[PDB]
């Protein structure tokens, strides 16, 4: 049962009350994640799923949210009979989670899309039987929430969501899938994934969440979409709102990806008074290098967007080269291709594109130009180098012939002069940890880039064609 205290500010008929709601659930012992989701999933409902009639905000009343929250717990308390899953020393078990996450699974539509918008929260589950991936992990952990399981809390990498339980919090469970076409895994733990040094799992260096940051989560899960041209500026705020005040809290801390969220809405609207994008972009790699070993991918990421919009060529590079820094400790292995993909659209569509210009600007006369910066041509090949290392030791291989050609062009883009400059030393000056480039090193200097020998050297082909 919802609680008379939870129940005082209904009825929310506005951004500012829905905040209030979120500030009195998180000054409360936990915060109640399924009252938080249903809310939350209503308004983005009326917002961006269908705004016929709406003229300022979609009024939650108690009744509709109350009846919502009796239909989830209803069909939890129903499905799971905790008399069947004793509970030693406050801890839940394998078996136990397994039955939540049948139970959710169990209840959604036979066929749906399943990267669809707005089938992220508990709205979604009891009123369209629907949700996405993380979201049957979050619904899991609201289930076990409800169902007086403590222990029982999010885990998330920048791919995946799952679960930690049980003495300590030390065991993991798999609760949903995957990606598109891989083997499921419900049940089992994550520690093979680990242990093969995939980006799937971090090595480790995953998220575990408690209930404030399952918050956090909730709230970065809104989805401002009405369509492809338009988003919903009164859930940009309230996503806003929340955020300063999980930030305020201290509940962002360990959240790279929400300070990146926050920097993005920042960079939209920004609200008077708060830290600017790029200290918040900072903030995200900080919590990184603190809380995850500097051994998340996105938060430099995050950073290198920002300053490709902003088309800054130099800064851009730099965080490029930073995050092929990550990428190189990991292996690639078979479901870590989402990171594939973003490195191969940076490498092969993003910089060629942001040198073009460039090129065409120092034609004419631009000054300070990142082309004739030899620290900016370092940073292109450290990227290289990130890439090249990270393929190292992976049961999968990362370049082919089709990254060859994009090299060469973006090469090029530099004038001789230019690269003469950097001094490639051995273990402005940079040190290569891949045998790739190490290879490739007196390629780099020449007044006319020699393009069949880098494909060679950045290519598995070692032969050229016979005739």
Same mark, same amino acid.
Request: one cysteine or more; hydrophobic letters at 40%.
């Given at each position: ?102 139970? %959710? ?38 289930? !076990? ?10 885990? @998330? ?9 049980? /003495? ?73 709102? @929340?955020?300063?005040?999980? =930030? ?6 360990? =959240? ?15 609200? /008077? ?26 938060? =430099?990421?995050?950073?290198?967007? *920002? ?22 400790? *990991?292996?690639? !292995? ?53 890439? !090249? ?7 999968? /291989?990362? @370049? ?27 273990? /402005? ?24 020998? %880098? ?13």
């Amino acid at each position: 049962g919802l609680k008379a205290a939870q129940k005082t500010l209904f009825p929310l008929r506005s951004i500012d009350d829905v905040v209030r709601l979120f500030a009195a659930e998180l000054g409360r012992e936990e915060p109640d994640l399924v009252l938080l989701s249903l809310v939350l999933g209503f308004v983005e409902h009326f917002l961006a799923v269908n705004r016929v009639g709406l003229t300022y905000f979609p009024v939650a009343d108690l009744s509709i949210i109350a009846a919502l929250y009796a239909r989830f717990t209803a069909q939890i308390r129903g499905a799971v009979d905790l008399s069947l899953y004793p509970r030693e020393g406050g801890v839940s078990s394998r078996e136990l989670v397994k039955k939540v996450s049948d139970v %959710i699974w169990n209840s959604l539509s036979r066929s749906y899309f399943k990267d669809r918008a707005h089938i992220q929260s508990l709205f979604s589950f009891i009123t369209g039987t629907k949700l996405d991936s993380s979201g049957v992990a979050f619904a899991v952990v609201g289930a !076990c929430q409800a169902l007086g399981l403590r222990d029982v809390h999010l885990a @998330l990498s920048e791919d995946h969501a799952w679960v930690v339980f049980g /003495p300590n919090g030390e065991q993991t469970a798999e609760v949903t899938w995957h990606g598109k076409g891989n083997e499921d895994r419900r049940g089992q733990t994550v520690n093979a994934g680990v242990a093969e040094r995939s980006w799937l799992y971090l090595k480790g260096s995953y998220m575990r969440c408690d209930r404030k940051m399952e918050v956090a989560f909730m709230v970065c899960a809104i989805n401002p979409s009405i369509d492809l041209h338009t988003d919903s500026l009164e859930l940009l705020q309230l996503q806003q709102k @929340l955020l300063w005040l999980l =930030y305020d809290l201290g509940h962002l801390e360990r =959240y790279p990806m929400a300070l990146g969220n926050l920097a993005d809405l920042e960079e939209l609207e920004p609200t /008077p008074g708060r830290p600017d994008p790029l200290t918040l972009y900072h903030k995200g790699i900080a919590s990184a290098k603190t809380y995850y070993r500097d051994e998340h991918i996105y938060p =430099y990421m995050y950073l290198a967007d *920002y300053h490709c919009r902003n088309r800054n060529v130099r800064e851009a590079l730099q965080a490029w080269a930073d995050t092929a820094t990550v990428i190189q400790d *990991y292996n690639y !292995c078979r479901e870590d291709e989402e990171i594939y993909k973003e490195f191969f659209e940076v490498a092969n569509d993003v910089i060629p594109n942001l040198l073009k210009e460039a090129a065409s600007l120092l034609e004419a006369g631009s000054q300070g130009s990142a082309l004739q910066d030899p620290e900016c041509f370092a940073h292109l090949l450290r990227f290289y180098d990130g890439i !090249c290392k990270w393929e190292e030791g992976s049961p999968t /291989p990362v @370049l082919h012939v089709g990254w060859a050609t994009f090299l060469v062009q973006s090469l090029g883009r530099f004038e001789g002069q230019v690269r003469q400059k950097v001094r490639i030393v051995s273990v /402005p000056v940079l040190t290569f940890q891949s045998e790739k480039m190490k290879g490739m090193k007196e390629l780099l200097v020449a007044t006319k880039i020699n393009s069949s020998a %880098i494909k060679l050297q950045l290519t598995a082909q070692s032969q050229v064609q016979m005739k």
